[model samples]
Target: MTLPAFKAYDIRGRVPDELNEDLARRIGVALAAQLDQGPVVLGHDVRLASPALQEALSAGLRASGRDVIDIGLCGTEEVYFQTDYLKAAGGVMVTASHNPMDYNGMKLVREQARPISSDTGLFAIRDTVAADTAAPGEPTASEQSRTDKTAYLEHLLSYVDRSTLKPLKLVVNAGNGGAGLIVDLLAPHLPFEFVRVFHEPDGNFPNGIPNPLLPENRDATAKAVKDNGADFGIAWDGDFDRCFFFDHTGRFIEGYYLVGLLAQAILAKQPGGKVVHDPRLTWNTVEQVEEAGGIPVLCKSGHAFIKEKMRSENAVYGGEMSAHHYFREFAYADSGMIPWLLIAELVSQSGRSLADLVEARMQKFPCSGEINFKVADAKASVARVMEHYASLSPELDYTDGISADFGQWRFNLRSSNTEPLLRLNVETRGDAALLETRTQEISNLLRG
Candidate 1:
């Protein structure tokens, strides 16, 4: 069975069957065709299959006469960083992210770490690989291994003033993914003490996969944070591209609220700069940015879309309610490492708890965190949702999804780009009661 593993945003599918060594190599060959001219930076997560798949990919790249700079085992963002940092033509990260054990995927980026999605050049490359016709012969390219983290470490530290950072103990949970490597690398340079949980790099995932979004998976981090009486807690997905935060109170900070807090934190340095935000959850971010002397620009959801918009507008910062935070200095690529570093700096300088920083925003724009509905038909379900609210005459905008603005309260519902489900996000003005009431109302409508 041919695995159509390609999605709108990235490539992902169940192992061996959907993605294997042969296919990975072919992707490398095809990816070589979409470049200007430079070595390809390669990296992989801790998935059991990642190294083998990455080797196959490098083989294809080298076969196509493209030099491959293997960064060895690292997070997804490191690929982006190394690509731009080394002035490479592009990069590929072999990672399944938060996917199950049997799955794997690759994220591709072009010069300057620009995303190569389906709408960009991904499908084009996919079709090229699908053809399976290799040119007569090309010289085998060289492969180099560079494990230096000097540049990446400096880049992370550049986000904040290290001297101001108080020695606050933090609960760091890598969930047995590739993030522990990063935390350890930053340890010697930082003032904070880390309580490592599931820290070692283990593809077997002894303590379950690395996703804090699920209530079950988040327990360890929350428990550790509270048990240790630490300053805060942080967890990352498989490839460690997106990081999740748990405040000192052992409460998981919703990614939405973090957007606003991050915006404020960033605005402090780059005042009056533009901050790009997704349409899914807006009011809080917009209000926060405006109040911080920064401009908040609304863009369609998704990393590729957000990154493109941020670059085009020269936005200083861009964030999605989904925990993907992009920065201007980081070539507009999202980083799991940067968010925590910035938050740590914020807490140290402000002398405030993570919860205290985001509490007001959480209250001012109470929200029903993203709720996923596995519907029979995503399109039909979204239509049903829109129809139910049509009588309210809410202002509608189809930016990546349906966003209906209804005065004090509003909701955004769209089909997941990577999953066959309807994603719903609703928010209201300082009314938890209204937030829940409307959330249930929409929930029933979606289910019905």
Candidate 2:
């Protein structure tokens, strides 16, 4: 069978055409051969095509002489926790993350729940699947088992310090995805009341896709918070790996600002600790890390690179502006479970609203979120923008992306790794007009 669906980081594409049972079976066999000689943990989300694909993948894994411990339907983080907690060789999560319902993919991990990106072992898996190579030996099957849900929940709760937490009301939007399971699991133990919206697990996604990054998707959560008199609202992507928050005023806070808030929180616990941050946006992160007496290490903008930097520097916390936060204590892996918990703790401890803690920082680092523009030549567009900005200002940096600084306002333009679009992020020091002006100028330069 031919398998052309595998990507650098994960196996992802539109279902039936780009990804199907055939590809799933092939990938399952190939990955099992590539990463494991022992048993492997398997999990999938509430996607429409998940059952067939999961069954085929289980067959393939068992075909390759590997035991399969199927966790049935679960979030991506649960798969990670299963691997780390069960002492499995690795785990496979059959999910497309925040992609549309029609699309499906797989996320792999090594022992101890470590990620398997292109730099690690994904490249080899891609090469093997591309080549359609067969296993060196015949396949065998072993017994199947289940993971302890209560134990996993208890393990997750260990991340929060119960003594310091206070009672607060929180609005949680599961987006009809996998977050409800976590919310249901953790609700009884916490000192807060959870006002849940779209919390039911639905593969059809009746409310719409669970991606809160899009302004439209956040409306339900925002309104739920305002109507329910909640302190704030929290939402997640399809797999519940990335968490987003809305302030008490029902304003959607940028993930970039949360990175700063989380860094400050981590720094308070371990002073002088190293904090890893992605290079997409850095000024506010640098200031926060410095202010917290923690060293800020600017790394490339991706999970693999940031996780590697965390290991090397022994960083206490790592964050991406895209809403992924990695904690050192959590095996240096990213957790959507911890970030919101910590934010809740932070707010409760300060006896302030979520808006109060983030308002000042939000003013200092006013951002235009991220804007994407399609271009025929990404490099040329980036260079043109960089050259145009260069003529206007001399203070510039081209580390991971092109960034120009003019004191009050700054903009960064970079090409996406998975798409042919140039992503632009503009921020200013407390001036919304300045941010709008710079963003408009850059858009005109790039689009015009």
Candidate 3:
């Protein structure tokens, strides 16, 4: 009953061994008991193994006397929408999100889609599931209602102003994942011409794993864009809750630049509004937020933390360098759908291409986005880099991650919370050669 798989934010681990239906059921009961609320909404993604787990979780919640609304085969963001739309006591999304096919996990939320993290009652849920203690309520029968998929699609469309849309030639790669279905539902209504690639939902991911951050996984989308002579290419992870982009020439644009672009877009309408960004990378976001007449609040890296900060600060929009963008309009939840829509709008309004926007940002903050390295000793490597950089740089900061600046170029080195790896991000002032050299130098130092 001891559930060590419950991490700081969500319940995540390898399947059958570290996670299973029994565990999910226990967590459900614990969650309901802790909230003292009924009618908890439950959802899962398109993973081949998700249906059984979703059913098991529903049984557990019913056993705890909580009514259940099952919205089957949904992305993480849709779970947020279900929670808000149904006015449920809370919600749970069964997904590991961008993890390997063999792995699956859960994302939980309280009423109004408020996130549950380590500091905010997730540990208690973990403990309750681990203990397997039954509450005073007798096991009860529950009914299941199918969530309206078409209505959900319509609801998503309502968030965007159709009149503001522009004609764009885009290549969309669903990565043989769930986004294809959603895109199929929405694309017919839009004004743009889409060159769709890998637009089928294949659980096996025959095209490749849907992760755009992996350089190899990006090839299909990139090639489709170039071959079609499209304005830009977009790709999504398996669940389609986070989006990645390639410019007209098939050059991959890092998520950091999109953060600034989206922030600028939102700030233009809601001047002086607040924007939230993760701490893993900062300078470009800070500059964009300031230039747009908005306040930028830096929060820890992770969706739960960012969502919490967004709600607390009433931020209009929040983005992470990992390609997740949160919108206040979307219940403060990150949506893979909203960012690209806004980007398209921005491009249309400016009469510029996606590459042009990225090129301009590159001139300002030439960033490495994020670089990862596997090391035998992550702490020691970070210490060595810090020690070496501190002696040389005139200004140094460790507010979120280790950041050092020499005016011409800056770099950040931080350890990953979930993996035994050190992530580095470097940026320079309009100097690609210097950026490359520094990136190699840092990698060499860490590797040595």
Candidate 4:
């Protein structure tokens, strides 16, 4: 096989063309050997092709003498939680996570839900999948169904004190993805009135792919919140691994602001604990962490980097501006379920609207949301930006990307890890005017 399906962190590619049942089976066989010992947890999203692909994966794992715990039709985070919670050797989530309908993929993890990226074991699995050409064999292990979600539901609730939560109305838009199922399970336990939109799990994705980040896809959730006079809105991707927030004012809150807001909420419960944050947007998170009496440690972008850093520092929480939130209690894995739970609790106890909470932060450190440029050469583009700003005597740090900190303004420029583009983010200290100008300047410099 050409092995185009294997990415730096997971197995993802076009369906049937780049990735098929045969390749998935080979991957399962290869993964069986990658683990040390114990059963493997397997789950899938609401994709039409997911069930068949998961069947092939389970077959290969079973044939290779590895037991499979099939957590049918769930979000990716459930796979992570169950893998570590059950003390399984590893786990694999069959999902494309907001990719197009023609695309599908899998996210793999080793014991304790640790990431198995390229630097870890993904490349080795890739090599094995590429070189393997073996015939089918009889199953040596068993495959069992595990649909019970009580444990995961309880774990999600454990993030905050349930008694403190008021009967607030929340707008939950699953976008007809797997997240709706999770919401239904948690609804009975909470005091919030949920206004569900496109809540059913449909593999056909009738309302288009469930990516909340796209400008076109956000209107449904935002309108749902306003029309219903709901407090705030929450939307999830296809597999529901990341969540986006819409304030009560029908404004989509920048994910960067949520990072600080979440850091503060986490710090309230767990004092003096370290909080890990990506370097893409720093000022707000660093300030929040410090103000919360917690240490903020900058790490490279990506879930693997954040999780590992959190583990090392014993960080209580970590969040990326892209909407990935990680909790140390959840095996240091990112969760779409946890953030909303904590936010619900925050709104309940603090009695402040989500808008009021983040608005102040947004104004305090106004930021130009992540902008992407498809340049010919990423390194050259970055150098051009650095050359333009060097005369300002900005303090530069290469934590994840190149973060240049000037007195009143700062920006982070870096090449995209998953795409052929350079990303830029500019932030000014309480100055939206400065933010716009600096963002435009950087945009011009990057293009030039």
Query: Which structure among the candidates has the greatest TM-score?
Result: 4
Per-model tally of clashing residue pairs: 0, 0, 0, 0
What residue pairs clash in candidate 3, if any at all? Answer: none
lDDT of each: 0.90, 0.84, 0.83, 0.91
Q: Which pairs of residues have clashing backbones in candidate 2? A: none
Name the runs in model 2 displaced over 4 angstroms. Answer: 1-4, 133-139, 417-419
Candidate order by lDDT, highest to lowest?
4, 1, 2, 3
The clash number for model 1 is 0
Mind giving the per-residue lDDT tens digits that candidate 4 earns over 252-350? Answer: 999999999999999999999999999888889999999999999889988999999999999999999999999999999999999998898999999
**Model 2, range 1-448, lDDT digits (tens) per residue?**
5345666667788999998887677777778877755688999888889878988888888888888899988888788888887889999898878888789988889887888987778878777767775643334786475845887788778766888888777888888888898888888898888998888989899988888876777888898888988888999988888999999889898899999999988888889999999767788999999999998998887787887889899999999999999988877888788999889888878887888888888888889988999988888787778777676675777777777788888877788776778888888888988889888888988886
In order of TM-score, best first, we have 4, 1, 2, 3
lDDT of 1 at 180: 92
Model 4, runs deviating above 4 Å: 417-420
lDDT of 4 at 44: 95
Which TM-score value belongs to model 4? 0.98
lDDT of 3 at 81: 82
